[PDB]
């Protein structure tokens, strides 16, 4: 994490001060949790440390971001590969594919491949419940994944899988193209 060193698996749309750039930003990020010695190195940086700074509150997807950059494991997440392997899939020059990868993935909440009714479920119930979701906006969603799912679902197993996903999405990839970062 803090040392540019040890094993750094990083095929990635960063040149070398990009990199260093993105290297200042998770510095920053870094120091709450290990104040003056860092001393966990890929295990920090913790949901906890992302969740500090001002615009990262109502933003829904906040804890999907953090579980596909990394995850697995409660506050052993973001480290500095991970950190660098996931704002290349959203930088300038990186592939429409990496994107809509990016976009079954929050769906896809146990990373098995799969949109299941379930997961479908608790992914827009996290966006859809914020400006008060009454008991008919709860039930028009809740009756609506059902549907898109019977619908899509075209190999017969009843859970999306990425080839299903980007037949509704990005067949002709037009919303894959859209996820862009400021770096």
Same mark, same amino acid.
């Given at each position: 994490?803090?040392?540019?060193?040890?094993?750094?698996?990083d095929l990635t749309f960063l040149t070398k001060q990009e990199i260093?750039?993105?290297?200042?930003?998770?510095?920053?990020?870094?120091?709450?949790?290990?104040?003056?010695?860092?001393?966990?190195?890929?295990?920090?940086?913790?949901?906890?440390?992302?969740?500090?700074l001002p615009e990262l509150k109502a933003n829904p997807f906040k804890?999907?971001?953090?579980?596909?950059?990394?995850?697995?494991?409660?506050?052993?997440?973001?480290?500095?590969?991970?950190?660098?392997?996931?704002?290349?899939?959203?930088?300038?020059?990186?592939?429409?594919?990496?994107?809509?990868?990016?976009?079954?993935?929050?769906? =896809?909440? /146990?990373? !098995? @491949? %799969?949109? *299941?009714?379930?997961?479908?479920?608790?992914?827009?119930?996290?966006?859809?419940?914020?400006?008060?979701?009454?008991?008919?906006?709860?039930?028009?969603?809740?009756?609506?994944?059902?549907?898109?799912?019977?619908?899509? =679902?075209? /190999?017969? !197993? @009843? %859970?999306? *899988?990425?080839?299903?996903?980007?037949?509704?999405?990005?067949?002709?990839?037009?919303?894959?193209?859209?996820?862009?970062?400021?770096?």
């Amino acid at each position: 994490s803090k040392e540019l060193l040890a094993e750094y698996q990083d095929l990635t749309f960063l040149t070398k001060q990009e990199i260093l750039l993105a290297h200042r930003r998770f510095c920053e990020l870094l120091p709450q949790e290990q104040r003056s010695v860092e001393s966990s190195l890929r295990a920090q940086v913790p949901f906890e440390q992302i969740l500090s700074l001002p615009e990262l509150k109502a933003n829904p997807f906040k804890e999907r971001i953090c579980r596909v950059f990394s995850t697995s494991p409660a506050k052993d997440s973001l480290s500095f590969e991970d950190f660098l392997d996931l704002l290349s899939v959203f930088s300038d020059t990186a592939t429409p594919d990496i994107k809509s990868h990016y976009a079954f993935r929050i769906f =896809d909440f /146990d990373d !098995d @491949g %799969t949109l *299941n009714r379930e997961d479908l479920s608790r992914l827009v119930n996290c966006l859809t419940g914020e400006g008060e979701d009454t008991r008919l906006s709860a039930s028009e969603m809740k009756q609506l994944i059902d549907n898109i799912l019977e619908e899509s =679902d075209i /190999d017969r !197993d @009843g %859970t999306i *899988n990425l080839s299903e996903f980007q037949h509704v999405i990005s067949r002709s990839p037009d919303f894959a193209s859209s996820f862009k970062i400021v770096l």
